[PDB]
Amino acid sequence: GPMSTIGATHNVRVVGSGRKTIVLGNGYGTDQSVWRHLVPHLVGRYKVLLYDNMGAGTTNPDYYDFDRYATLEGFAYDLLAILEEFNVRKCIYVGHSMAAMVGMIASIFRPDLFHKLITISATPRMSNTDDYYGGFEQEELDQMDEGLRMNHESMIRGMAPLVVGGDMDSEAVHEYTRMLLNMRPDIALSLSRTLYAFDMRPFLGQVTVPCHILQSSKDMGVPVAVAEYLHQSLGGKSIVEVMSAEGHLPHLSAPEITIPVLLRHIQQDI
Amino acid sequence: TIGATHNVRVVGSGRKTIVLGNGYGTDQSVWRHLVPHLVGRYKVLLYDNMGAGTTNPDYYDFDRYATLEGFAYDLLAILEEFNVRKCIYVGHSMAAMVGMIASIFRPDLFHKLITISATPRMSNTDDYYGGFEQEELDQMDEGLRMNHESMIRGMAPLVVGGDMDSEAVHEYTRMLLNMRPDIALSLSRTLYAFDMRPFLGQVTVPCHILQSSKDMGVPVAVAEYLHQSLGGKSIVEVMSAEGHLPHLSAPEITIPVLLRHIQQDI
């Protein structure tokens, strides 16, 4: 009855101390160590909750429920369950990419739990349509999927430097490559396919909590125009900041620039 | 993989490394008020003992963990895997006894031990006060066995003590309720019959013995017994904080005491 395994299965960690709580959600294929340059600057004034989304290399693959996670709201249910279990009444939610969209969905189901959302490299939809520019044609996504299934390790070793950007053999490229490779390949494929088909656009007007939209000046997964799209479509308050840093994972690869941006948007309200 | 199994996390920087060991049924978030005061000066290693609600119960090896001896192996294995030569070790309750067991094999690894709510034997004998008669430990065992969740919901606020209906009481209740009941029963019975006394004399590493007032599990006399019995240097500080988990429930008192003893050796 009262026994919850969600803290063990999702590697939930509460650190820091303070009146307000910050929750950090990881993007595709990453684990919470991606936040290790941010957390030191939060713990003096904030409680911080870290966790890994189901299917990460740091999590047990036997617990990945394919039907649950076939579409993204399954991860939103996990987030709400973590907030319930750890008695998080209200939080500042920072989410990278996938986790930005998960926090959006969760904030629609339960706006009371979210003081605001802060997004990094968020896109509501990857593939272009006749009236929307996501940065990918569907044929590109299909070819990317074909490369991933045909030779999973080679695809990952090659894509990780391009996604991180600005210099392979950077430490961040190595960590990202390692987290991607530590995923079980069938889970990596399934979640990739979920993200290829995800479409937040119809739902964006339902978001009412304030959103701080941050993104890099050059992100191979997210054209900067998509950040402006979100700003025009969200149902509540929002602000966009394009950072000088490049890359899909700037909190990992450009913390010297990104952490100060993040802190500014944590403190200040729109 | 022992790093992943025990949720080992390393943070901070400096010549000293501080290792924090958690008490029964408790995970490393109990140290969350202390760690931000440490990382500007020290490297800090946090981990969870097997059986904690944050660990996978499938990996609780009952034969391995049948005596407190089994948790020191884990500690040393963790200390080796993360390349920690010499640590300052802060252990709460059972972890104080573990770091002490572990210091007996390996003095070289511990610059000193700091203990919170440490006790070498819970049950009274004729020449010793531990705070509990054997019948009391018997009733507590039977209470856990007969209704796990009811036992915990009642005992957790008692054990935390101090201020009532606190954030600390909720977290302690939550972590105890997340243990698998057979593990909780197993580990509790070990702690109920454990006896460290014949080994204290071989504890030669210096030990800072910090004791809350009004700790339902450790009378104040036990801190003085440990002070008398350890083989090396020791000092006792009785704290004004109340309760069994003052690092969790009274950090505003306990953290400055901890910082003082981390920095001042004697």
Numbering used by the authors:
A (entry chain A): -1 to 268
B (entry chain B): 3 to 268
What sentences appear in the manuscript?
Castilleja foliolosa’s KAI2d proteins include high-turnover enzymes, in particular KAI2d15, which features a substrate binding pocket with a methionine cluster at its entrance that is involved in the trade-off between substrate turnover and affinity. In summary, our research reveals that Castilleja possesses a large clade of KAI2d proteins, acting as strigolactone receptors, participating in activating a parasitic state in the plant.
To obtain additional insight into the strigolactone perception in Castilleja, we solved the crystal structure of KAI2d15 at a resolution of 1.8 Å. We found 3 methionine residues in the crystal structure of KAI2d15 that surround the entrance to the protein’s substrate binding pocket, including an alternative side-chain conformation of M142. To study the effect of these methionine residues on the receptor’s substrate specificity and sensitivity, we created a protein variant, replacing the three methionines with valines (KAI2d15 M142V M153V M157V). The mutant protein showed destabilization at lower ligand concentrations when GR24 or 5-deoxystrigol were present, while the wild-type protein destabilized at lower concentrations of strigol or orobanchol. We specifically compared Michaelis-Menten parameters between the KAI2d15 wild type and the mutant, in which three of the methionines at the substrate pocket entrance had been replaced with valines (KAI2d15 M142V M153V M157V). While the turnover numbers (kcat) of these proteins showed no significant difference, we found a 3-fold decrease in the Michaelis constant (KM) for wild-type KAI2d15 as compared to the mutant version (0.8 μM in wild-type KAI2 vs. 2.4 μM in KAI2d15 M142V M153V M157V). We observed a linear trade-off between these two catalytic parameters in all investigated KAI2 proteins, except KAI2d15, and remarkably, the trade-off was restored in the KAI2d15 M142V M153V M157V mutant. Thus, a possible dual role of the methionines in both enhancing substrate binding and promoting product release might be the molecular basis for KAI2d15 mitigating the typical trade-off observed in enzyme kinetics.
